[PDB]
Amino acid sequence: YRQSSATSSFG
């Protein structure tokens, strides 16, 4: 799960 809808930068 990506916290705070992680952007492609983080994900």
Residue type, 8: S
Cβ-in-10-Å burial (0-12, 13-18, 19+) of 4 comes to exposed
Tokens encoding 5: 């809808």
Whole-angstrom Cα distance, residue 8 to residue 11? 5
Please tell me the experimental approach by which this structure was elucidated: NMR
Site of tokens 């492609």: 8
Site of tokens 């990506």: 2
Written as one string, the DSSP assignment of 1-11 is --TTS--TTT-
Task: Please check whether residue 10 is in contact with residue 2, taking contact to mean a CB–CB distance below 8 angstroms.
Answer: yes
What Rg do the C-alpha atoms of the chain give, in angstroms?
A: 6
Site of tokens 């916290």: 3
Residue type, 2: R
